[PDB]
Amino acid sequence: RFLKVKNWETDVVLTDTLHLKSTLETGCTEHICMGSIMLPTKDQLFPLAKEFLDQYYSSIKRFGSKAHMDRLEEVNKEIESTSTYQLKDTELIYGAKHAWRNASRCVGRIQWSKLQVFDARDCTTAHGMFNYICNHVKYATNKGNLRSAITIFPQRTDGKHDFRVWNSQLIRYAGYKQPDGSTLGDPANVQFTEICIQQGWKAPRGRFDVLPLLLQANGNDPELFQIPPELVLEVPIRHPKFDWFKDLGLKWYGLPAVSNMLLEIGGLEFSACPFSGWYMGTEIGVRDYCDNSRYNILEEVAKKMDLDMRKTSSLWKDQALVEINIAVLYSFQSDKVTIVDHHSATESFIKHMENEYRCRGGCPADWVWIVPPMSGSITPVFHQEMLNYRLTPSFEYQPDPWNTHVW
């Protein structure tokens, strides 16, 4: 019930007391660990409100004050009456920052307190959402000097009026399945890309076509919008030593911006809440480029390097994987667009773990996701025991809306 975690490289031992505030469930039991699965009323709402307001007022050193009790009172009044309630701006800012502090899969959390929050609760139409998103993208991009932000659309009501952003990120490349049997562009997005066509987009049918936003306001059918091309910062990918690398014609976008998640604050559900920071190099170079189900460019790169592709034990995949990742980091740095490498990012997160243990008595972390998809054991998070648990406020997954929505 007081739990220790050890680092096996530094012998440093931390004690975790924060897990005892754990509210949600893991998928795990005493008989089966599910640590590696990707996805494992008036009544219910007041408990959830109180727990949140309790943490808010405690965090402002005002726990048990009249202001605290008054708000608890007022929120109670409002729920009994209206069956939901509204967050004060300050609460909303605190809850969003905290949903990020609590994301156990995020290596980037040392940054959690510098989140710019844009309150879009007054938005009513998709065009409004388009406007709020364009502003988010531009503020966050900041001419390549990236700044973290989140934009919060109105909260769920009766569930018949959700605001959703259909895209999974604000900025992603299209995918088209070809007669040739293969797949052009990003195969992750094939299905979404078809819905844009079914909804009316005219795809350039290219390899790196920035997708149209598909926006749903007040539970209405969703609507198409192109992001002003001038707002979508992109980086052409070159190598500091391999001149031929440019000839691959690889580019990636600067702005990682997750748009399909659901933000839960004090019981309220914000089903559209796109947020963004900046990339860790491996996200693009290891996963986007090299996953079999993605752009999968290892075969082609290794060929240009003239490596012995005859046998797996030449480690030609591994060799090419490194150079690709050097190239991503090099390109972004040269174009002055913010990026972080896996060494620096995991080192930073260890320091952030330290701080959270000292100051909060823990830090939920999911090892499976925190350890980078290349060079695991040479980054220090590999050697670091972590405890994974669910704290609220939080971001949660939700079904792709095309399975949910009715036309």
Ligand X SMILES: Cc1cc(N)nc(COCC[C@@H](CN)OCc2cc(C)cc(N)n2)c1
Ligand Y SMILES: C[C@H](O)[C@H](O)[C@H]1CNc2nc(N)[nH]c(=O)c2N1
Answer for the pair 213, 231: CB distance below 8 angstroms, yes or no: no
As annotated, the binding site for heme b includes: 106, 397
How far apart are CB 278 and ligand X at their closest, in Å? 6
As annotated, the binding site for L-arginine includes: 169, 278-279, 283
182 binds a copy of itself (CB under 8 A): no
101/124 Cα distance (integer angstroms): 29
Q: In sequence order, what DSSP letters do the residues of 155-192 get, joined into one string?
A: PPSSSSS--EE-SSBSS-B-EEE-TTSSEEE-GGGHHH
Under rule CB under 8 A, which residues in 6-45 are in contact with a copy of itself? 6, 8-9, 19, 22, 25-38
The two tokens of residue 66 are: 């009249």
54/95 Cα distance (integer angstroms): 12
Catalytic residue among 91, 264, 283, 356: 283
Place of tokens 């924060």: 18
The two tokens of residue 96 are: 């969003």
Interface characters, 282-301, with ligand X (x: CB under 6 A): -x------------------
Helix (H, G, I), strand (E, B) or coil at 379: coil
Q: Which is nearer to ligand HEM, 15 or 293 (CB)?
A: 293
Q: Which is nearer to a copy of itself, 272 or 365 (CB)?
A: 365
The secondary element (H helix, E strand) that includes residue 214 is strand 213-216
The two tokens of residue 291 are: 């996953």
Q: Which is nearer to ligand HEM, 53 or 345 (CB)?
A: 345
Answer for the pair 346, 375: CB distance below 8 angstroms, yes or no: no
How far apart are CB 36 and ligand Y at their closest, in Å? 4
Under rule CB under 6 A, which residues in 222-261 are in contact with ligand X? 256, 258, 260
Catalytic residue among 91, 106, 123, 238: 106
264 is catalytic: no
33 binds Zn ion (CB under 5 A): yes
367 binds ligand HEM (CB under 6 A): no
283 is catalytic: yes
- State which of residues 46, 225, 369, 402 lies at the interface with ligand Y (CB under 6 A): 369
294 binds ligand Y (CB under 6 A): no
Per partner kind, with CB cut-offs from 5 to 8 A, the member of ligand Y, Zn ion, a copy of itself, none near residue 369 is: ligand Y
Helix (H, G, I), strand (E, B) or coil at 300: helix
Region at 341 (left for phi over 0; alpha for psi -120 to 50; beta for the rest): beta
244 is catalytic: no
Residues annotated catalytic, as ranges: 106, 109, 278, 283
